[PDB]
Amino acid sequence: FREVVETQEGKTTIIEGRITATPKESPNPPNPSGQCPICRWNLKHKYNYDDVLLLSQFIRPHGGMLPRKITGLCQEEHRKIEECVKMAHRAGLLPNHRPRLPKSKPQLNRYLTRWAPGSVKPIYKKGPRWNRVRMPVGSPLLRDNVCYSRTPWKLYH
Amino acid sequence: RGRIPGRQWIGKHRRPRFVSLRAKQNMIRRLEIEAENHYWLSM
Amino acid sequence: HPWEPGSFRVGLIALKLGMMPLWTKDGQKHVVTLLQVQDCHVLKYTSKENCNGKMATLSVGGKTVSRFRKATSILEFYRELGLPPKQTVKIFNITDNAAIKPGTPLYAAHFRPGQYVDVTAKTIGKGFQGVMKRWGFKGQPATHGQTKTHRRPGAVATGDIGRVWPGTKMPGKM
Amino acid sequence: GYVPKTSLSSPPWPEVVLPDPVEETRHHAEVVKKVNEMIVTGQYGRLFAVVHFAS
Amino acid sequence: VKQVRVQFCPFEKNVESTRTFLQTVSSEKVRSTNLNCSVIADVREPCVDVLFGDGHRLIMRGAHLTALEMLTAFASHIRA
Amino acid sequence: SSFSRAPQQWATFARIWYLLDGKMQPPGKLAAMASIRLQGLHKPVYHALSDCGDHVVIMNTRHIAFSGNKWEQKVYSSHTGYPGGFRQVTAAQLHLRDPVAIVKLAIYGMLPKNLHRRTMMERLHLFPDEYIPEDILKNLVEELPQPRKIPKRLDEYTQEEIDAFPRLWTPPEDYRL
Amino acid sequence: TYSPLPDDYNCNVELALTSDGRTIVCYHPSVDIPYEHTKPIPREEGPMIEQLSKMFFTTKHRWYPHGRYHRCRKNLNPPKDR
Amino acid sequence: FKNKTVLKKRCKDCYLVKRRGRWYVYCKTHPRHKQRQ
Amino acid sequence: SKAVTRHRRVMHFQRQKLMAVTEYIPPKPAIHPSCLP
RNA sequence: CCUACUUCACAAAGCGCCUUCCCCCGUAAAUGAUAUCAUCUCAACUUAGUAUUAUACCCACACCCAAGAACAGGGUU
RNA sequence: ACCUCGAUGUUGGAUCAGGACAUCCCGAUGGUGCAGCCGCUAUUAAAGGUUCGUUUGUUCAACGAUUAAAGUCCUACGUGAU
Ligand SMILES: [Mg+2]
Ligand SMILES: [Mg+2]
Ligand SMILES: [Mg+2]
Ligand SMILES: [Mg+2]
Ligand SMILES: [Mg+2]
Ligand SMILES: [Mg+2]
Ligand SMILES: [Mg+2]
Ligand SMILES: [Mg+2]
Ligand SMILES: [Mg+2]
Ligand SMILES: [Mg+2]
Ligand SMILES: [Zn+2]
Ligand SMILES: [Zn+2]
């Protein structure tokens, strides 16, 4: 990881870049030949939004996701990680990855929030039983996650 | 709000009916029984 | 305590004496009512915590009345307070800055000219009044065939709902 | 086949290890003997019974 | 902007950023935008020194900076 | 056993006080637990005519957590009765107004729709924050486990767990991040 | 060390099978409360109905009287079991 | 802004952005290209 | 209603169950081929 | 509400007089990733952007009454 | 031609109106063949308002004078035990 440092001296500002210490993948992945980190470490369908220890490894210091060309994630797992990161941010599980810079907003505890809180209109007219307007929960991208319960996940409530 | 015109289950505009996993499993079970019946009648 | 922004002081209980004209320097008449403060005293004080409301409360009593026509509990309360029973007691919401010891008298000078005030009172009771007078309904014509319908309400509701909506304007006490 | 510890890496329910059959059969025999000795010594008061009668 | 100077050692590696910066800054569109602005693409770690019309100097050491970052800083200082 | 008739009956049909902590808990699961306890369906001696309900005290109801976007999508509807008196207030607005209405309404809906529901709601006690009255606290008997385990934040994860979790990829050395 | 259920409440369950395996024996002696898990012994109509409802955590409805019809319908000599 | 069930970029400068829960065609050179899903 | 209708005629519940049971099930290739060499 | 005017006259009225106090959202923008540009963001987020309305009101025989169908209510020092 | 013919009184008007928004006016907003004034178009908004007359039974229509506007509808083409 390189960091750009700028110093203003007199009227001659300098700016350079220094390569700090970089993390290294843990030795001996359980499943070598995996084309991406997840499928290589046997995590294809065994992580959720709350697995911050996993998600943060693909996180910019301010909460943004990292590109595929850098992370090495396959497309599907990259989408899954992005959605899990969004859900974790909305649930407040990443308090040290906040946006760079605040009036006090009401504190409502959330989790498994698919949509941005400010982009969903209230369901004033829920439909009849056969056409009910249901509130999405979680993400369909995780529909294939390992299900230890007999009943599958209910992605809509 | 949310009216089904006329009578449910008969008209052109019927109340939608959806098959549950329970019903699917029941039908599959009956199909398995009938397949075994075919086998035992084939001899 | 000295006055501070956001402070609410106590009011009074006056007696509506009447009305009279009053002309301003621009030659404009104004009808002005007379409110006489008759034996207005602070009677009870309850703090924020005691009353559970957002503001403390001061009870103010006015228009001393006969002790022979009051309940025993009220007579005991006024005997403890040291004042004759009052006709009306009203509760004023105040900040703790404006707390006043019970028994203190209040005077019309509590207000001053140029101030703006709110006055609450029981309106003149007109009894069970018809819809026309109570709600200003237009009513029906006096002539042109109208049979026994000149001041009656029209349709009170619609046929579909098969009922009368709560809060419907109907004849009643005004 | 190692999987890093995640919310879904392992089943939610705790892992249970049943006793080995030999030692468990020995314990079964010991418990049966204890209850049999209780019956022999009459260390019981009222007895209730679930009995299938009629239907 | 008054003058722009880019220095680098091509036989030494880690010069792609500065070389691309030179190509982009010397692109005919920029020089036509400011003909008065003078580019001196010397060459001899790699550095870029920009002197503006207000006598203000920006120094970008492109050893570990990508061309996009260098150009963004250059444009930001142009805006001032 | 060996109790007298009246003490035995009292012990059997005694009402217990349970405590639920709603911090970061789904109001629906809280309501399910509370409704079971209030109806007394957790007692083997249960019967709808036995009035075997138990007191449920739910604290921190202000800090309940809704799954999904229910805070903005769930609408609580009511009608004052007067024309134009239809009020539809979102879950977030209702929570901000009354910090107990969400759980109260969830329990009310989950309870059976008969004449005992209001008595069960009387037995129910709800408190927005950690504070509980002293008499209620003394009445409390048992604390029920929270239906939802609260996930740990990164700030809460210990360094040992972070070290145990492996690094899944080698980031390029010359990346600004 | 395996226990099908915790033994900290109620009886201590021990399951067994007779040698023939045709009958299950259960040894469940009751557990006594430890002395350390114990504490030392310490040493108008409207308002009335409201007070009673507050006291017994019920609604006002049950505290109102009933008519002669219901009062005389109530059975004053109900059958008694045990 | 015109409401369209199908969004089309009517020139090079039009761009698609998903905002407040729906897609928008925004354009600065030709504001009349502004479309809302 | 005729056998052929301008709208999608509602199927008898048993026919609906038959169709749902006889829906196409794609072959699941165990390990996803995307992340195999 | 009755000080005037008017109908009128111990009063009721208007044609007379007096008092009447907060929002709502469609979009327009900052910073910024997925996609190191850019991007108003069903990304995290910062403003216009406020509701969770706030405050206000009410809170204890008998005779007469501005209280009233009855009842009830106020006064009787 | 499914309820009602051992009766579900049915045009227009008066009276009182409840509701929808697919908004006529007032509010906010994007576009314009938006210079300004008028406009047109679209998003959001139903809290409030949405005139008086001549002929005609007219609902409507025309016309006269206005208005910020003189909205489209549903309500047994709302409402005749008013
Ligand atoms: Mg029908
Ligand atoms: Mg008249
Ligand atoms: Mg007649
Ligand atoms: Mg007459
Ligand atoms: Mg950027
Ligand atoms: Mg017929
Ligand atoms: Mg026929
Ligand atoms: Mg009949
Ligand atoms: Mg609209
Ligand atoms: Mg019709
Ligand atoms: Zn993969
Ligand atoms: Zn365009």
Curated annotation (Swiss-Prot), chain A:
**What GO molecular functions are on record for this protein?**
small ribosomal subunit rRNA binding; structural constituent of ribosome
The gene designation is MRPS18A
Question: Main subcellular localization, coarse class?
Answer: mitochondrion
Shown stretch of the complete protein: 35 to 196 of 196
- Give the organism, scientific name: Homo sapiens
Where in or outside the cell?
Mitochondrion
Instruction: Give the quaternary structure.
Output: Component of the mitochondrial large ribosomal subunit (mt-LSU). Mature mammalian 55S mitochondrial ribosomes consist of a small (28S) and a large (39S) subunit. The 28S small subunit contains a 12S ribosomal RNA (12S mt-rRNA) and 30 different proteins. The 39S large subunit contains a 16S rRNA (16S mt-rRNA), a copy of mitochondrial valine transfer RNA (mt-tRNA(Val)), which plays an integral structural role, and 52 different proteins. mL66 forms a zinc-binding site with uL10m.
UniProt KW keywords: Mitochondrion, Ribonucleoprotein, Ribosomal protein, Transit peptide
Its recorded name reads Large ribosomal subunit protein mL66
Q: Which is a GO BP term held by this UniProt record?
A: translation
Tell me what else is known: There are 3 mitochondrial isoforms of bS18 in mammalia, localizing to 3 distinct sites in the mitoribosome. bS18m (bs18c) binds to the same site as bacterial bS18, mS40 (bS18b) binds to a novel location of the 28S small subunit, and mL66 (bS18a, this protein) binds to the 39S large subunit.
Q: Which family does it belong to?
A: Belongs to the bacterial ribosomal protein bS18 family. Mitochondrion-specific ribosomal protein mL66 subfamily.
From Swiss-Prot, chain F:
Single GO term (MF): RNA binding
Q: Provide the positions where the record notes the PTM N-acetylserine.
A: S1
* Gene3D superfamilies registered for this protein in UniProt: Ribosomal protein L13
Q: Which cellular component terms (GO) are annotated to the entry?
A: mitochondrial inner membrane; mitochondrial large ribosomal subunit; mitochondrial ribosome; mitochondrion; ribosome
Biological process according to GO:
mitochondrial translation; negative regulation of translation; translation
Q: Which PROSITE patterns match?
A: RIBOSOMAL_L13
InterPro entries given in the database record:
Ribosomal_uL13, Ribosomal_uL13_bac-type, Ribosomal_uL13_CS, Ribosomal_uL13_sf
Q: Which residues form a coiled coil?
A: none
Pfam families (alphabetical): Ribosomal_L13 (PF00572)
Keywords carried by this UniProt record: Acetylation, Mitochondrion, Ribonucleoprotein, Ribosomal protein
Give the UniProt subcellular location, in the record's own words: Mitochondrion
Q: Which domain of life is it from?
A: Eukaryota
Q: Which family is it part of?
A: Belongs to the universal ribosomal protein uL13 family.
Q: How does it assemble?
A: Component of the mitochondrial large ribosomal subunit (mt-LSU). Mature mammalian 55S mitochondrial ribosomes consist of a small (28S) and a large (39S) subunit. The 28S small subunit contains a 12S ribosomal RNA (12S mt-rRNA) and 30 different proteins. The 39S large subunit contains a 16S rRNA (16S mt-rRNA), a copy of mitochondrial valine transfer RNA (mt-tRNA(Val)), which plays an integral structural role, and 52 different proteins. Interacts with OXA1L.
PANTHER family the record matches: LARGE RIBOSOMAL SUBUNIT PROTEIN UL13M, RIBOSOMAL PROTEIN L13
Q: What is this protein called?
A: Large ribosomal subunit protein uL13m
Please name the source species.
Homo sapiens (Human)
Q: Which gene encodes it?
A: MRPL13
Curated annotation (Swiss-Prot), chain G:
- Which keywords does UniProt give here? Mitochondrion, Ribonucleoprotein, Ribosomal protein, Transit peptide
Q: Where in the cell is it found?
A: Mitochondrion
Record-stated family: Belongs to the mitochondrion-specific ribosomal protein mL42 family.
> What GO MF annotations does this protein's record show?
RNA binding; structural constituent of ribosome
The GO annotation for biological process reads: mitochondrial translation; translation
Write down any Gene Ontology CC term.
mitochondrion
Q: What is this protein called?
A: Large ribosomal subunit protein mL42
Principal localisation: mitochondrion
State how it assembles: Component of the mitochondrial large ribosomal subunit (mt-LSU). Mature mammalian 55S mitochondrial ribosomes consist of a small (28S) and a large (39S) subunit. The 28S small subunit contains a 12S ribosomal RNA (12S mt-rRNA) and 30 different proteins. The 39S large subunit contains a 16S rRNA (16S mt-rRNA), a copy of mitochondrial valine transfer RNA (mt-tRNA(Val)), which plays an integral structural role, and 52 different proteins.
Instruction: Read off the lineage from the record.
Output: Eukaryota, Metazoa, Chordata, Craniata, Vertebrata
In terms of superkingdom, the source organism counts as: Eukaryota
Curated annotation (Swiss-Prot), chain I:
Q: Could you describe the subunit structure of this protein?
A: Component of the mitochondrial large ribosomal subunit (mt-LSU). Mature mammalian 55S mitochondrial ribosomes consist of a small (28S) and a large (39S) subunit. The 28S small subunit contains a 12S ribosomal RNA (12S mt-rRNA) and 30 different proteins. The 39S large subunit contains a 16S rRNA (16S mt-rRNA), a copy of mitochondrial valine transfer RNA (mt-tRNA(Val)), which plays an integral structural role, and 52 different proteins. uL10m contributes a single cysteine residue to a zinc-binding site with mL66.
Q: Where in the cell is it found?
A: Mitochondrion
Instruction: Please give the positions of the paired cysteines in each disulfide bond.
Output: none
Quote the protein name from its UniProt record.
Large ribosomal subunit protein uL10m
Whole sequence portion shown: 30 to 66 of 261
Specify the taxonomic lineage: Eukaryota, Metazoa, Chordata, Craniata, Vertebrata
Q: Which gene encodes it?
A: MRPL10
Q: Superkingdom of this entry's organism?
A: Eukaryota
Per the record, the coiled-coil ranges are none
Q: Which family does it belong to?
A: Belongs to the universal ribosomal protein uL10 family.
